[PDB]
Amino acid sequence: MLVVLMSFGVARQAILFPNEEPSWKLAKNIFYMPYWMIYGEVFADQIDPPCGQNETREDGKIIQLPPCKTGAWIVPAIMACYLLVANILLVNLLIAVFNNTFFEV
Amino acid sequence: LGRKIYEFYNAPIVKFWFYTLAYIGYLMLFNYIVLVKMERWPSTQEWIVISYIFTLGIEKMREILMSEPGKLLQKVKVWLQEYWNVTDLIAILLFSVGMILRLQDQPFRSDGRVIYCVNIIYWYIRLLDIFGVNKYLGPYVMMIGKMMIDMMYFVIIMLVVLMSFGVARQAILFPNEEPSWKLAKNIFYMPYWMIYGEVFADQIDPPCGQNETREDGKIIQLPPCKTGAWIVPAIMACYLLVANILLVNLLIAVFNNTFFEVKSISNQVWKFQRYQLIMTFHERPVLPPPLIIFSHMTMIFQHLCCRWRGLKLFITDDELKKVHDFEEQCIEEYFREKDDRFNSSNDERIRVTSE
Amino acid sequence: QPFRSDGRVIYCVNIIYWYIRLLDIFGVNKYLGPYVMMIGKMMIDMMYFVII
Amino acid sequence: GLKLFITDDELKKVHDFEEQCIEEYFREKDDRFNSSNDERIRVTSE
Amino acid sequence: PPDYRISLIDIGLVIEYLMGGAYRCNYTRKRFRTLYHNLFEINHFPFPFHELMVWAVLMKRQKMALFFWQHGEEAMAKALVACKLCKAMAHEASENDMVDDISQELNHNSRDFGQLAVELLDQSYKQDEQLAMKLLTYELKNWSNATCLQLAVAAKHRDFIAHTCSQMLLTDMWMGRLRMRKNSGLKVILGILLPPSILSLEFKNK
Amino acid sequence: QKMALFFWQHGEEAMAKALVACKLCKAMAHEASENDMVDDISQELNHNSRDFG
Ligand SMILES: CC(C)CCC[C@@H](C)[C@H]1CC[C@H]2[C@@H]3CC=C4C[C@@H](OC(=O)CCC(=O)O)CC[C@]4(C)[C@H]3CC[C@]12C
Ligand SMILES: CC(C)CCC[C@@H](C)[C@H]1CC[C@H]2[C@@H]3CC=C4C[C@@H](OC(=O)CCC(=O)O)CC[C@]4(C)[C@H]3CC[C@]12C
Ligand SMILES: CC(C)CCC[C@@H](C)[C@H]1CC[C@H]2[C@@H]3CC=C4C[C@@H](OC(=O)CCC(=O)O)CC[C@]4(C)[C@H]3CC[C@]12C
Ligand SMILES: CC(C)CCC[C@@H](C)[C@H]1CC[C@H]2[C@@H]3CC=C4C[C@@H](OC(=O)CCC(=O)O)CC[C@]4(C)[C@H]3CC[C@]12C
Ligand SMILES: CC(C)CCC[C@@H](C)[C@H]1CC[C@H]2[C@@H]3CC=C4C[C@@H](OC(=O)CCC(=O)O)CC[C@]4(C)[C@H]3CC[C@]12C
Ligand SMILES: CC(C)CCC[C@@H](C)[C@H]1CC[C@H]2[C@@H]3CC=C4C[C@@H](OC(=O)CCC(=O)O)CC[C@]4(C)[C@H]3CC[C@]12C
Ligand SMILES: CC(C)CCC[C@@H](C)[C@H]1CC[C@H]2[C@@H]3CC=C4C[C@@H](OC(=O)CCC(=O)O)CC[C@]4(C)[C@H]3CC[C@]12C
Ligand SMILES: CC(C)CCC[C@@H](C)[C@H]1CC[C@H]2[C@@H]3CC=C4C[C@@H](OC(=O)CCC(=O)O)CC[C@]4(C)[C@H]3CC[C@]12C
Ligand SMILES: CC(C)CCC[C@@H](C)[C@H]1CC[C@H]2[C@@H]3CC=C4C[C@@H](OC(=O)CCC(=O)O)CC[C@]4(C)[C@H]3CC[C@]12C
C-alpha cells in the first residue's frame, strides 16, 4: 500500500500544485490526502474543482475562479485507478491471506 | 586487496544491492525534481535524473546488441517477450518526449511536468517489481499479477452496471442540456465514487417544487420537480446494493479460491524466477546506471583495443566420460528402484497371490 | 405535455433493462458466462440478505 | 441443422457399431470389476 | 503441395520454432547443410538415440521415446529437451485448438518427461553431490552448446529448479566468490556503504 | 540417529532423555537453518526432533 499510495500522492501533489517552495509540508500533503481514501471519505469537495470559469457565488456574482494551472483532468483518472486498485485489490488480497492463515492457526 | 575488492564488486548480490540503492536514490531524486520549481534551465537534480534515464536506455540498447540470438530481428523479439522490458522502453521514450517538451518555452513545460508525473507513477511500479527478490514479497507480486484478470472481469461487469445507472440518473434529473462532452463525465463521475464510501447525500433527492427556508427565514422558491425524479433514489438504492454487496463479495470469493490455487505453488515460482534474476544481475556490469558510462567506455576500449587488433563450466573428455558413466549408473539405479517399488506395492502382491 | 416526460422516464428504465440484456449477451465468453451464472446463483442469497 | 438424414444401410452400420460398442463397454466393466482388489481378496478367501 | 521427401532441414526449423530462444540445432547449422546439400560413416550420427527420440517425440510415439531415453548418453538433457518439445507441441495444439485429448496427452507427455528428469536429478543427488553438480553445469556439445539448467529454464520446469541441487547452485552463484554468509543483506549494505568493511569479509580460496 | 534410538532403549530416565534429545535436535535444526546449509539435513534434524518428541 505504501508504494501505491505515496505513488499517487506524489502525482497528485505535483499535478495540482506546481508553485510551492521547498518545505516539509510537501511530505504531509503526499501522505495526508491519499491515506483516508481507503477508509471511507473521498474528499468530494477537493477533487476536480471547476477552474478557468466564472462560477456563481452565493449572491449571484460570478467570481473569477483561478484557471486550470496544468492539465489537471489527469488526477481524477489516476484517482479512480488508485482507489480501485488499492481498496478492491489489496484489501481483498489480505482478506484471502487472513483466511488461509486462520486455516493454519 | 585489489583482487579482494574486485571479487567483492563482481559478485551478483553486491551488484544487485548496488543497483537497488542507486534506484532508490534515483527515485528520491525524481521526487525532489518533480515537487520543486523547474526554471528555464534544468537544475542539478534534473540533470542527474536525465543522465540516469539516458544511461539506462544506452544500457538496454547494449543488452540488445549483446543478446544471444544472432539474427538482429530475433533479438528484439526475444527482448519483447518480457513485459517489463517493453514498458521500460515505453517509459524511456516518454521521458525523452517530456524532456523535449520541457526544454522549450511555455506552454510545453507544463506538459513536460505532466509526463514527469506519469513517469513517477511508472517508476514506483518498477520499484514494486524490484521488490520481488524477497521470498515473501515475490509471491505476493505474482498473486497480484494473477488477480489482475479477475480485476478486469470485475471492471467489465461493474462498468456495465455502473454506467447503466449513470445513464439513467443523467437522463432523469437532467432533461434540458445540449449535446456536449460533459454528459459522459456526468455519467462516469457521480456513480463511480458511490462504491468507495461517500454517497453524495446533499446531491440526492433534493426538495423540489417547494418554497424551502433559506438561512434568514426566507422561503425561496426552489425549482420544481422537472420529471418524476423519485425514481432515481430507488434505482440508486438498487444499484448501490447490487454493486457493492454482490460484486465486491463475489470478487472476495474469487480472490479466495485463486489464492488457494497460488498458495500451493508459492515458493516454487520464486525459485523459478531466481535463475532469471541471477542471470540478469550477473550479465550486468559492475557500476550502477548513473555511472554505467564508465563501464561502457572501458568495455569499448577493451573490445576495440585488446580484441579488435557463468554457470557454463567446460569439461574435458575424460571427465565427460566419468559424468556419462555416473549418469548411466544413476538411471539404471532409478529404474531398478522403480521396479522394486512396483513389485512391493500391495496390488501387485494381491494379483500374484491370486494367480 | 405532460406525457412526454413520462415517456422519458420509460425510456430511462428501458436503458436499464437493455444494459442488463447486454450483460446477458456477454455470456458467450468461457469466463464471463460462468460469472453470469454465479450472479444468478447468488441472487437468492441476496434476497435472504434483503429480508433480514 | 444438426439433424442429418441417414439411409437404411448406414443405419444398419451405425446400429452394428452401437452393439459392438455396448458389448465392448460391458466386457471392459466386467474385467475392471474382476481386476479390483476386493474381488481378488474375496476369491482368495473362498 | 504434397510435400513429399520432407527434408531434415525443415524439421530442424520445426525444432527452432518449438525449442524457442536461441536454440541452434545441428540441422540448421550450415556445416551440416553443406553435407545435406552434397547428398540430394559420413552420413552416420555419433549419437543415434538423440535424433531417434527427437523423431519419436515429433511423431507422438511415446513408448519409443521412453525406450530411446533408456539408451544412449546425456539422459538428463534428452529428458528436458523432450519435455520442452512436448510442452511446445501442446501449446501449439491448444492454439490451433484441435481435438482436445491430444493436447491433454501432449501435456501429459511433457509432465511425464519432466517428472523423469526430476527423479533422475533426485537419484543423482542421492548418489554423488559433485558429480550431479557437474552433470547440471557442463556444456552440451550436441545441443547448441547449452547447459541442462538453460534447457530447464527454457522448458519452464518449475519443479526441476525447485530441487535443492539447482537451488544450491543458484545460491553458490548468488554470493559468488565471497563466502562471509552471516546475515547477508545487512552485511552487504555494510559492505557497499562504508567501503572499508570487506577486509573482515572472508572469501573462497581458489 | 539409529544409535540414538538404541541408546534411548536402554538405561533409565527415558522421558528426560527423549525431551533432551528433542530440544538438542530442534536447536541443531535452527542452527542449520540459520547457517542455511544443504536443506535436507535441516529437514531431517527437524524430523529427528519430531521423532524424539
Ligand atoms: C522512493 C521512496 C521509497 C521514498 C521517497 C522519499 C521522498 C518522499 C523524500 C526523500 C527526499 C525528500 C526531500 C529531501 C529534502 C527536502 C528539503 C526540505 O527543505 C527544508 O526543510 C527547508 C529548506 C530551506 O528552506 O532551505 C523540505 C523537504 C524536502 C523537499 C524533502 C521532501 C520529501 C523527499 C522528496
Ligand atoms: C514502512 C512502514 C512500516 C512505516 C513507514 C513510516 C513512514 C512512511 C513515516 C513515519 C515517519 C513519517 C514522517 C514523520 C514526520 C514528518 C514531518 C512532516 O512535516 C511536518 O510536520 C512539518 C511541515 C508541515 O507538514 O507543516 C511531513 C511528513 C513527515 C516527513 C513524515 C513522512 C512519513 C514518515 C516517514
Ligand atoms: C467502474 C470501473 C470500470 C472504473 C471506471 C471509471 C472511469 C470510467 C471514470 C471514473 C471517474 C472518471 C473521471 C472523472 C472526472 C474527469 C475529469 C474530466 O475533466 C474535464 O472535463 C476537464 C475539467 C477542466 O478543464 O477543469 C475529464 C474526464 C475525467 C478524467 C473522468 C474520466 C473517466 C473516469 C476516470
Ligand atoms: C544517485 C543517488 C545514489 C544519490 C547519491 C547522492 C549524491 C550523488 C547527490 C544526490 C543529491 C545531491 C545534492 C543535491 C543538491 C545539492 C545542492 C547544490 O547547491 C545548489 O544547487 C546551490 C548552490 C550552488 O549553486 O552551488 C550543491 C550540490 C548538492 C549538495 C548535491 C550534491 C550531490 C548529491 C548529494
Ligand atoms: C539510500 C541512499 C542511496 C540515499 C541516497 C539519496 C540521498 C543522498 C539524496 C536523495 C534526495 C537528496 C536531497 C534532495 C534535494 C536537496 C535540496 C538541496 O538544497 C538545494 O538545492 C538548495 C540550495 C539553494 O537553493 O541555494 C540540498 C540537498 C538535498 C537536501 C538532497 C540531499 C541528498 C538526498 C537526500
Ligand atoms: C497510483 C495508481 C493509479 C497506479 C496504478 C496501479 C496498477 C497500474 C499496478 C498496481 C500493481 C501492478 C501489478 C503488480 C504485478 C504485476 C506482475 C508483473 O508482471 C509479471 O510478473 C508478468 C510479466 C511477464 O511474465 O512477462 C507486472 C505486471 C503486474 C500485473 C502489475 C500491473 C500494474 C499494477 C496492477
Ligand atoms: C453501450 C456502451 C457499451 C457504450 C455507451 C457509449 C456512450 C456513453 C457514448 C457513445 C456515443 C456517444 C455520443 C457521441 C456523440 C456525441 C456528440 C458530442 O458533441 C460534441 O462534441 C459537440 C457537438 C456540437 O456542438 O456540434 C457530445 C458527446 C456525444 C453526445 C456522445 C456522448 C456519449 C455517447 C452517447
Ligand atoms: C474496459 C476498461 C478496462 C476501461 C474502460 C475505459 C473507459 C470507460 C474510459 C477511458 C477513457 C474515458 C474517456 C476519456 C475522456 C473523456 C472526455 C470527458 O470530457 C471532457 O473532459 C470534456 C467535457 C467535460 O467533461 O467538461 C468525458 C468523459 C470521457 C469521454 C471518458 C469516458 C470514459 C472513458 C471512455
Ligand atoms: C435494505 C434493503 C431491503 C433495501 C431497501 C431499500 C428501500 C426500501 C428504500 C431505500 C431508499 C428508499 C427511497 C428513498 C427516497 C425516495 C424518494 C421519495 O420521493 C418522494 O417522496 C417525492 C419527492 C418529490 O416529489 O420531490 C419516494 C420514495 C423513495 C423512492 C424511497 C423508496 C424506498 C427506498 C428505495
Q: How was this structure determined?
A: cryo-EM
Residues of chain E with C-beta less than 8 angstroms from the C-beta of F33: none
Instruction: Judge if the upstream peptide bond of residue B288 is cis by omega within 30 degrees of 0.
Output: no
Q: Is A13:A26 a contact under the CB 8 Å cutoff? A: yes
Residue B219, beta-bridge partner list: B213
Residues of chain B with C-beta less than 8 angstroms from the C-beta of D44: 350, 353-354
Resolution (A): 3.7
The C-alpha cell at E159 is: 519443479
The total of other beta-carbon atoms located within 10 Å of residue A80's CB is 15
Distance CA A11, CA A13 (A): 6
Q: Which atom of ligand 8 is nearest to the CA of B163?
A: 8
Distance CA B276, CA D8 (A): 65
Q: Is B260:B207 a contact under the CB 8 Å cutoff? A: no
Residues of chain F with C-beta less than 8 angstroms from the C-beta of E167: 39
Query: How close, in Å, is residue F4 to chain E by CA atoms?
Result: 23
Q: Distance from the CA of B28 to the center of ligand 5, in angstroms? A: 9
Which bound ligand lies closest to the C-alpha atom of B205? Answer: 9
Whether E58 and chain F come into contact, CB under 8 Å, resolves to: no
Cα dist. C30→B153, B161, B258, C14, E7 in Å? 12, 20, 17, 28, 41
The total of other beta-carbon atoms located within 10 Å of residue A83's CB is 20
Distance CA E25, CA E33 (A): 11
**Where are the alpha helices (H) located in chain B, listed in sequence order?**
2-9, 12-35, 44-65, 72-80, 83-102, 108-130, 137-172, 182-189, 231-240, 249-263, 267-283, 292-305, 317-343, 346-354
Contact yes or no, F with E (3+ CB pairs under 8 Å): yes
Residue E77 exposed, middle or buried by CB count within 10 Å (0-12, 13-18, 19+) = buried
The C-alpha cell at E157 is: 520446469
Contacts for B204 with CB less than 8 Å, ≥ 6 apart:
B232, B233, B236
Contacts for B212 with CB less than 8 Å, ≥ 6 apart:
B219, B220, B222
- Give which of B227, F25, B127 is closest to A6, Cα–Cα: B127
Contacts for B137 with CB less than 8 Å, ≥ 6 apart:
B131
The total of other beta-carbon atoms located within 10 Å of residue E194's CB is 9
Q: Which residues of C touch B (CB under 8 A)?
A: 5-6, 8-9, 11-13, 15-16, 19-20, 22-23, 26, 31-32, 35, 38-39, 42, 46, 49-50
Backbone angles phi and psi of E5, in degrees to 5: 55, 65
**Cβ-nearest to A83 among B140, B155, B196:** B196
Q: Which atom of ligand 2 is nearest to the CA of A6?
A: 8
Q: Which residues line ligand 6 (CB under 6 A)?
A: A 4, 7-8, 78, 81-82, 85; B 82-83, 121, 125, 128, 141, 144-145, 148
Backbone angles phi and psi of B351, in degrees to 5: -65, -45
Q: Kindly identify which residue of chain B lies nearest to residue D42, measuring between CA atoms.
A: B354
Cα dist. B332→B275, D4, E84, E138 in Å? 30, 57, 24, 21
| Record: contact D43-B347, CB cut-off 8 A | no
The C-alpha cell at E165 is: 541441487
What is the residue whose three cell numbers read 522502453? B89
Residues of chain A with C-beta less than 8 angstroms from the C-beta of B192: 80
Query: How close, in Å, is residue B195 to chain C by CA atoms?
Result: 17
The number of C-alpha atoms within 13 Å of E172 and in the hemisphere containing its C-beta is 12
What does the radius of gyration of chain F's CA atoms come to, in whole angstroms?
Answer: 12
The C-alpha cell at D28 is: 471392459
